[PDB]
Amino acid sequence: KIYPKLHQMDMDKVSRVYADLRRESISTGSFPITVRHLESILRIAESFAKMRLSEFVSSYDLDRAIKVVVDSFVDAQKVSVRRQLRRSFAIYTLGH
Amino acid sequence: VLPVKIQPPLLRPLAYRVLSRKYGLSIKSDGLSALAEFVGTNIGANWRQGPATIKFLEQFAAVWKQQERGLFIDQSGVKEVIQEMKEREKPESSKALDWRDYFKVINASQQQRFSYNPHKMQFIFVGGIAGFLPDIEDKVQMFLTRYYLTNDRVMRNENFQNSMSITPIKNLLGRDAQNFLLLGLLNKNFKGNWSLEDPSGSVEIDISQTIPTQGHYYVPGCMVLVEGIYYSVGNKFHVTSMTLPPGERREITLETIGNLDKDLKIRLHLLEKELTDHKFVILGANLFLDDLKIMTALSKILQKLNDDPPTLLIWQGSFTSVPVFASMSSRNISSSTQFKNNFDALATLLSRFDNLTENTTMIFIPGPNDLWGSMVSLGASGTLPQDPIPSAFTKKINKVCKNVVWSSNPTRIAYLSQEIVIFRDDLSGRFKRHRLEFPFQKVQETRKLVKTILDQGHLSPFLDSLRPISWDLDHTLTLCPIPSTMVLCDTTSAQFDLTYNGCKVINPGSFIHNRRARYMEYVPSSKKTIQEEIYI
Amino acid sequence: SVLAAANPIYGRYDDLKSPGDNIDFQTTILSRFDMIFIVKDDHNEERDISIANHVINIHTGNANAMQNQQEENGSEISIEKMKRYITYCRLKCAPRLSPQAAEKLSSNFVTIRKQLLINELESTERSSIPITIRQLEAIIRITESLAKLELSPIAQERHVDEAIRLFQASTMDAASQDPSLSEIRRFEQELKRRLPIGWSTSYQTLRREFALDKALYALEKHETIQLRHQGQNIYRSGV
Amino acid sequence: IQNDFDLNTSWIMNDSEFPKINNSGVYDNVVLDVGVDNLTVNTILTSALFVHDAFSNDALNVLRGMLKEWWDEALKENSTADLLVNSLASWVQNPNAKLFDGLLRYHVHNLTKKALLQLVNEFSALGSTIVYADRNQILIKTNKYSPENCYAYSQYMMKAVRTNPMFSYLDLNIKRYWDLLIWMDKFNFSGLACDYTAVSQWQLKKFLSPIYQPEFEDWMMIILDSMLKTKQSYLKLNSSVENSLNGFSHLFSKPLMKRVKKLFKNQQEFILDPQYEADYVIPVLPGSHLNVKNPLLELVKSLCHVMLLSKSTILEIRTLRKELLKIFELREFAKVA
């Protein structure tokens, strides 16, 4: 009975996150970052909006999805580059 | 002839009755008002203007061929054309035809874009601060258009005269030892061996044991007609005889292009006979104003011309002794302002002659050491379609005279039905330097130069790495119509006057050969030239 | 017509491995296909931003407006209209090549096979992507389809040029993928020591010094040299 | 052959752009404003220590020998010798010279480029990163935190540079000492200069509306003072991933946010009303290429950028920028922001 919509959002933040994810995937990484991982952010944001029974995806529900995706990407990297990757991606998870 | 003012409302019925019903022309309110003004001025009581309107509409339909006659430009144009046809018949005007309305000079930046549709068509193509910057596709097609023009010339001349066909270079691949006749652009491969470039591809050529036509200059970038046997063992074309494409007469090109109206042709033909006594004076090359001796000699030349001023006084390039460039100095070296001082000094020696500088168009042609072109090239042969001398340096010279034109280096003259092309360039030196040797007097060399230029059909048949050319302004160098008169100015070639394939080629040479200020005189009516050497 | 989508072994293309190792299809099956596209993930930031901004617009309802506006503008065709047009073209026009078109097709097939032969000779191993007479018929069919969509009864040289471009962009691109070594190392060392870091040398001179000289292209990849004057000048870019 | 166009000759003629190494950030360490001199002369002198694009080696050797002679002469008392060394440095690139050669000038330019690159590498090996190098001056980030421990280290660095034969004739003098430096470009920098003088040369200020130019100038001084206070506190406590500056924004974050809110309300009141358009006007400068719709937003963008210059405090300044942009109801990653 819930189908949240992505009307209010900052597509620039998601685009920047996806570009950074791909750039760090090609160099010093092995997790494949395709467009599927761009759509995963939107799908996870919609699931988070479903949890609050909301009919519109809020900014918090998008920042949380971005944090989930970047965390899953970072934690699967080798321990040598994990600190650098976390430092690089910290600017998107500001607030938590 | 009685003046009267007639309002558009009363003229509107009859006006439409003829313009719209008889022929189908829509008249706007402003155009109707302008036509009413014209009728009221050139006739009174506005009753017997029916023939005037009929002539207007028939001329409009014969030439303009559109609707909405009331544009303030169509009406004015048709009225003017009626004026000249009435004048040649010998109202608004009953005077004699003036050549000034039929004399014009075309700059390299104001010609018509003519790109040839590869199958059979010569199309017409015709925006801001950087609106003059050519596009990349212009550079891509710069040589393709030239090849297509040369290929059309060959398909018109060679087969009807000599009947081997032209096989595109891409067709030589599977063939093992057959004989082919290729039309390609001679050039040097990046691997360092000669080759021919064609729109379909390229092939390396074995130039050993080749018999070339001795009456031509062969240089990289010129399009040649090689003949030989292809070999697939090493993918080489063993050329046997290679020659430049045959030239074409101008009249032949005119019927193919089909560009003139009949009345304009008749008027131009009439003033050709009427204007028998017109003299064109072509000055020498390298008018080094910085030199005091040349300055004094120019004074005597101008004094001699002052007695009988000619129609056009053409000034050749390199007006200053040293190339102009940004000079770091605190003196009056100031290569910019020193050019201004030289032109001001020219104004003093030129304004002194009242009889001269009057009823005499003064065309100036830039050279290798002129402003805005010598800044980067430092006096070398840089970009070919040179922009005219900047107007910032011509204040006094233009103020002194009343008809002075600053034109491009490859400029065009439209004095009559004939076209005159002026070109200042050291073609002989480059041709001799870059002519390739075959492992297998002076008049002969001049004939070789003229034949090479005309057979190539291009002002500079050179590679882009030897004479950079503005990509869009390449038609200004193509001799597609082969103009009747060409001023092939030069400084490294002996003065000559030769005719070839219906084209008259004249080279005034250097201004000072040994001790004389040589200059040339041209009479368009008699098509006869004469040099006037004056001792220093 | 068979439109088949596949996946090279190891998922990614893995261009480090040989082109024949990525593709597990036999030569026989690969020869049937007229165009064999090998797409790759560029990982280009400027393109990634564009793709992301397009996909987000797809998700946030903007597609249902933008596509409709484009279709009503006349720059697109609805499915129900393109289907009818395709049926009409297939049942109305069957173009046949003009002789000038046939000459171009033959002279291009010869070039393509020569390129494949030299690549095979250099690699000393049969190319995984084959070029055969069936591919000449493939170019013929592409030309005829290009003419067919315009309902032109005869296929001019425009269609031949575009069909050749399509084949070069798909099958020649698939076949041109590349992974002696001592010669390459010697050439790199000698040109690094001889040719200075900031100057340039012409390529005929390097030929005199001496082959295919793929080392220069490899160095161009590493951005240590740069061919600038239409390939006639080799300039050490600064590495 | 010199009178006709040649692609290689044309390229070597119209190519004089000098590479610049510029690193932007906040450098709490002491950085020295080293000003190089006699690079071209030293370069031709030490250049001793197939290619169609290169000048003749023998002519260059002749030039080197002659320059060596004049050099040694001027070293001993020789007036004309030094006059001529400086003049040669200046003539090589003079077309009016009666022996000027484009190939020679290009060769000298490449030698100078490579000598400067080698000097940068030498300074890096000595233990000091480079933040600027433009053939006339070089700025080195000495790792010595304490401004007192600067003179001996600097003199050791200059002597070590002079030890190398390649830079023996290269004379270097330190012009200024920066205790603190906020470096963006040559024309956009600020900091403490010698540790007591302070300079605010920000060309970004010229592109703000005249009402907000004093605001930017004042807030730059505030930011610099806060950075200085934080560095002093860190040094007192103790005596890049993380440097002395880690909470300098906390000193002025709240006053800045309140001031921005007040300025936004004032703008909303007076943005459209006349008699105030003389203040809310974007200046026209030769480099102007940006259309500005919210001059206050441009001011806060400039302040947030100069604060984001520091690598260590990226996160705490991004949070401040997000809070500032919340006032304009702008997203943190918006294109306009």
Q: Tell me, letter by letter, the H, E, C secondary structure of B14-81.
A: HHHHHHHHHHCCCCCHHHHHHHHHHHHHHCCCCCCCHHHHHHHHHHHHHHHCCCCCCCCCHHHHHHHH
Q: Kindly list the residues from chain A whose CB atom is less than 8 angstroms away from the CB atom of residue C13.
A: none
Cβ contact, residue pair D4, B376, below 8 Å: no
Question: Rounded to whole angstroms, how far apart are CA atoms D257 and D325?
Answer: 10
Please, what is the angle between helix A11-26 and helix A59-75, to 10°? Answer: 0
Q: And the tokens for C125? A: 């191993």
Question: Rounded to whole angstroms, how far apart are CA atoms B46 and B55?
Answer: 16
- The owner of tokens 């390609």 is B184
Alpha carbon B355 to its chain centroid, in Å, reads: 30
Contacts (Cβ under 8 Å, ≥6 apart) of A52: A58, A61
Residue C233 DSSP code: E
Q: What amino acid occupies position B275?
A: L
Residue B364 DSSP code: E
Question: Rounded to whole angstroms, how far apart are CA atoms B6 and A79?
Answer: 97
Contacts (Cβ under 8 Å, ≥6 apart) of D218: none
**Under a CB-based contact definition with an 8 Å cutoff, are residues B197 and B182 in contact?**
no
Question: Rounded to whole angstroms, how far apart are CA atoms B108 and B201?
Answer: 32
**Nearest beta carbon to residue D8 from set C194, C196, C200:** C200
**Nearest beta carbon to residue C53 from set A5, A15, A25:** A15
Question: Rounded to whole angstroms, how far apart are CA atoms B416 and B429?
Answer: 33
Alpha carbon B444 to its chain centroid, in Å, reads: 26
Residue D155 DSSP code: H
**Under a CB-based contact definition with an 8 Å cutoff, are residues D92 and D105 in contact?**
yes
Contacts (Cβ under 8 Å, ≥6 apart) of B428: B445, B449, B490, B492, B493
| Closest to D292 in 3D by CA, of D308, D302, D281 | D281
**Under a CB-based contact definition with an 8 Å cutoff, are residues B393 and B335 in contact?**
no
Chains B and A touch (3+ CB pairs under 8 A): no
**Under a CB-based contact definition with an 8 Å cutoff, are residues B362 and B105 in contact?**
no
- DSSP letter for each residue of B503-533: EEEEE--BSBSSSBB--EEEETTTTEEEE--
Question: Rounded to whole angstroms, how far apart are CA atoms B175 and B320?
Answer: 58
Chains D and A touch (3+ CB pairs under 8 A): yes
User: Which burial class, exposed, middle or buried, applies to B521 when counting CB atoms under 10 A from its CB (0-12, 13-18, 19+)?
Assistant: middle
Phi first, then psi: give them for residue D12, nearest 5 degrees: -70, -25
**Under a CB-based contact definition with an 8 Å cutoff, are residues B26 and B69 in contact?**
yes
Instruction: Report the phi/psi class of residue C2: left, alpha or beta, with left for phi > 0 and alpha for psi in -120 to 50.
Output: beta
**Under a CB-based contact definition with an 8 Å cutoff, are residues B387 and B372 in contact?**
yes
- The owner of tokens 């001496």 is C210
The CB-side HSE value for C100 (13 A sphere, CA atoms) comes to 11
Contacts (Cβ under 8 Å, ≥6 apart) of B188: B194, B195, B220, C232
Q: What amino acid occupies position D160?
A: A
Question: Rounded to whole angstroms, how far apart are CA atoms D240 and D26?
Answer: 10
Residue D169 neighbours by CB distance under 10 Å: 20
In sequence order, the β-bridge partners of residue B498 are B505
**Under a CB-based contact definition with an 8 Å cutoff, are residues B363 and B421 in contact?**
no
Residue D227 neighbours by CB distance under 10 Å: 26
**Residues, chain B:** 536
Question: Rounded to whole angstroms, how far apart are CA atoms B388 and B315?
Answer: 12
Instruction: Report the phi/psi class of residue B209: left, alpha or beta, with left for phi > 0 and alpha for psi in -120 to 50.
Output: left
**Under a CB-based contact definition with an 8 Å cutoff, are residues C152 and C93 in contact?**
yes
| Closest to B408 in 3D by CA, of B388, B381, B423 | B388
**Under a CB-based contact definition with an 8 Å cutoff, are residues B483 and B500 in contact?**
no
Our CA-based measurement puts residue D65 at a distance from the nearest CA of chain B, in whole angstroms, of 27
Our CA-based measurement puts residue A93 at a distance from the nearest CA of chain D, in whole angstroms, of 10
Question: Rounded to whole angstroms, how far apart are CA atoms D170 and D162?
Answer: 7
Q: Where are the beta strands (DSSP E) in chain A?
A: none
**What is the helix (H) or strand (E) element at residue D329, kind and residue range?**
none
**Under a CB-based contact definition with an 8 Å cutoff, are residues B290 and B320 in contact?**
yes
| Closest to B142 in 3D by CA, of B162, B113, B164, B163 | B113
In sequence order, the β-bridge partners of residue C234 are C201, C227
Cβ contact, residue pair D334, A10, below 8 Å: yes
Phi first, then psi: give them for residue D327, nearest 5 degrees: -65, -45
Query: In a mutagenesis test of the D interface, which of A8, A12, A63, A83 is the best target, namely the one with the most D β-carbons within 10 Å?
Result: A12
Q: And the tokens for D74? A: 């001027």
Q: And the tokens for A14? A: 């998601």
**Under a CB-based contact definition with an 8 Å cutoff, are residues D47 and D179 in contact?**
no
Contacts (Cβ under 8 Å, ≥6 apart) of B516: B533, B534, B535, B536
**Nearest beta carbon to residue D335 from set A12, A87, A95:** A12
User: Which burial class, exposed, middle or buried, applies to B87 when counting CB atoms under 10 A from its CB (0-12, 13-18, 19+)?
Assistant: middle
**Residues, chain D:** 337
Sign of CA dihedral B451, B456, B459, B465: negative
Question: Rounded to whole angstroms, how far apart are CA atoms B379 and B306?
Answer: 33
Chains B and C touch (3+ CB pairs under 8 A): yes
Experimental method: cryo-EM
- The owner of tokens 């295919």 is C212
**Under a CB-based contact definition with an 8 Å cutoff, are residues D228 and D178 in contact?**
no
Q: Kindly list the residues from chain D whose CB atom is less than 8 angstroms away from the CB atom of residue C200.
A: 8, 51-53
Percentages helix, strand, coil for chain A, rounded to the nearest 5?
65, 0, 30
Residue B171 DSSP code: G
Residue A12 DSSP code: H
B205 in helix, strand or coil? strand
Sign of CA dihedral A5, A7, A13, A16: positive
Phi first, then psi: give them for residue B522, nearest 5 degrees: -125, 130
Question: Rounded to whole angstroms, how far apart are CA atoms D202 and D197?
Answer: 16
CA angle C213, B233, C135 (to 5 degrees): 80
Question: Rounded to whole angstroms, how far apart are CA atoms B466 and B379?
Answer: 15
Phi first, then psi: give them for residue D140, nearest 5 degrees: -115, 140
Question: Rounded to whole angstroms, how far apart are CA atoms D157 and D139?
Answer: 13
Q: What amino acid occupies position C210?
A: F
What is the β-pairing status of strands B520-523 and B503-507? Answer: unpaired
Question: Rounded to whole angstroms, how far apart are CA atoms B311 and B520?
Answer: 13
Question: Rounded to whole angstroms, how far apart are CA atoms B203 and B197?
Answer: 7
Alpha carbon C37 to its chain centroid, in Å, reads: 8
**Under a CB-based contact definition with an 8 Å cutoff, are residues D113 and C198 in contact?**
yes
Residue B381 DSSP code: B
**Under a CB-based contact definition with an 8 Å cutoff, are residues B517 and B294 in contact?**
yes
Question: Rounded to whole angstroms, how far apart are CA atoms D235 and D146?
Answer: 9
Long-range contacts of D293-298 (CB under 8 A, 24+ apart): D293/D336, D294/D328, D295/D208, D295/D209, D295/D211, D295/D212, D295/D267, D296/D212, D296/D260, D296/D263, D296/D264, D296/D267, D296/D328, D297/D328, D297/D330, D297/D336, D297/D337, D298/D207, D298/D208, D298/D209, D298/D212
Cβ contact, residue pair D96, B327, below 8 Å: yes
Sign of CA dihedral A21, A25, A28, A30: positive
Chains B and D touch (3+ CB pairs under 8 A): yes
Sign of CA dihedral C21, C25, C29, C33: negative
Cβ contact, residue pair D5, B433, below 8 Å: no
Nearest Cα residue in chain D from C207 = D50
Alpha helices in B131-261 (DSSP H): 136-161, 250-257
Phi first, then psi: give them for residue D141, nearest 5 degrees: -95, 95
Question: Rounded to whole angstroms, how far apart are CA atoms C140 and C131?
Answer: 14
Phi first, then psi: give them for residue B23, nearest 5 degrees: -125, -25
| Closest to D92 in 3D by CA, of D65, D67, D120, D118 | D67
Give the burial string for D296-322 (b: 16+ CB within 10 Å, else e). bbbbbbbbbebbbbbebbeebbbbbbb
Sign of CA dihedral C131, C137, C139, C142: negative
Give the burial string for C87-126 (b: 16+ CB within 10 Å, else e). eeeeeebebebbeebebbbebbbbebbeebeebeeeeeee
Question: Rounded to whole angstroms, how far apart are CA atoms D97 and B325?
Answer: 13
- The owner of tokens 């040989």 is C18
**Nearest beta carbon to residue C198 from set D50, D52, D110:** D110
Q: And the tokens for D304? A: 């947030």
**Nearest beta carbon to residue C196 from set D8, D11, D54:** D54
CA angle D211, D216, D219 (to 5 degrees): 130
**Residues, chain A:** 96
Q: Kindly list the residues from chain C whose CB atom is less than 8 angstroms away from the CB atom of residue D54.
A: 196, 199
User: Which burial class, exposed, middle or buried, applies to B511 when counting CB atoms under 10 A from its CB (0-12, 13-18, 19+)?
Assistant: buried
* DSSP tally for chain C: helices H, then strands E: 12, 5
Q: Kindly list the residues from chain D whose CB atom is less than 8 angstroms away from the CB atom of residue C197.
A: 110, 114
Q: Where are the beta strands (DSSP E) in chain D?
A: 21-22, 25-26, 31-37, 128-133, 138-142, 171-183, 188-193, 197-202
Question: Rounded to whole angstroms, how far apart are CA atoms B326 and B339?
Answer: 12
Q: In whole angstroms, how far apart are CA B89 and each of B95, B335, B413?
A: 10, 56, 27
Question: Rounded to whole angstroms, how far apart are CA atoms B347 and B390?
Answer: 16
Instruction: Enumerate residues 161 to 190 of chain C having a beta carbon within 8 A of any beta carbon in chain B.
Output: none
Instruction: Enumerate residues 67 to 96 of chain A having a beta carbon within 8 A of any beta carbon in chain D.
Output: 87, 90-91, 94-95
Question: Rounded to whole angstroms, how far apart are CA atoms C177 and C185?
Answer: 22
Alpha carbon B391 to its chain centroid, in Å, reads: 21
Instruction: Report the phi/psi class of residue C233: left, alpha or beta, with left for phi > 0 and alpha for psi in -120 to 50.
Output: beta
Residue D81 DSSP code: H
Question: Rounded to whole angstroms, how far apart are CA atoms A51 and C143?
Answer: 55
Residue B399 neighbours by CB distance under 10 Å: 11
C41 in helix, strand or coil? coil
**Under a CB-based contact definition with an 8 Å cutoff, are residues D280 and D211 in contact?**
yes
* DSSP tally for chain B: helices H, then strands E: 13, 19
Q: What amino acid occupies position B477?
A: L
**Nearest beta carbon to residue C59 from set A6, A15, A34:** A6
- The owner of tokens 């003259």 is B413
Question: Rounded to whole angstroms, how far apart are CA atoms B378 and B326?
Answer: 10
**Under a CB-based contact definition with an 8 Å cutoff, are residues B371 and B394 in contact?**
no
Contacts (Cβ under 8 Å, ≥6 apart) of B257: B122, B481
Final resolution, Å = 3.1
